[PDB]
Amino acid sequence: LGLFGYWQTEEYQPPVAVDGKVPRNEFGNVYLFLPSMMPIGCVQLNLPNLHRV
DNA sequence: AGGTAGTCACAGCTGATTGCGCTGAGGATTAGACGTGCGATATCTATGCCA
């Protein structure tokens, strides 16, 4: 397991939603450990059953 | 007076229907570090020996 140092890591730049498409990771989701990780043009909503709508 | 076309009333053909089965998205959920008792290893040095 490669433990990279602070000098080897710069910064995570969140993507930008294009043409009404939400960017997704390799697994089809978005990592939202921090608010800055949210892609530009995206909003997180805590609405139950929102995906069905 | 004579006859066959328009029309209405009972038969076949077919899609909708009520029993049942799959998918896809929700809400619930042990193997190193840190410290310790123990067992093997170091070490400073008081004292008696002869040349």
Task: Name the helicity range.
Answer: under 10%
The termini sit apart by: 41 Å
How many extended strands? 0
Radius of gyration: 14 Å
Shape: elongated
Per DSSP, the total helix count is 0
Roughly what fraction of the amino acids lie in strands? under 5%
The main β sheet shows up as:
none
Question: What structural class do the secondary elements suggest?
Answer: little secondary structure
SSE layout:
Layout: no helix or strand
The structure holds one DNA strand of 51 nucleotides.
Describe the structure.
The chain is largely without helices or strands. It is 0% helix and 0% strand. The protein is elongated. The N and C termini lie far apart (41 Å). The protein binds one DNA strand of 51 nucleotides through loops.
Quickly describe the structure:
The protein is largely without helices or strands. The structure holds one DNA strand of 51 nucleotides.
Q: Which features does this protein show?
A:
little secondary structure, 53 residues, 1 chains, DNA-binding, 0% strand
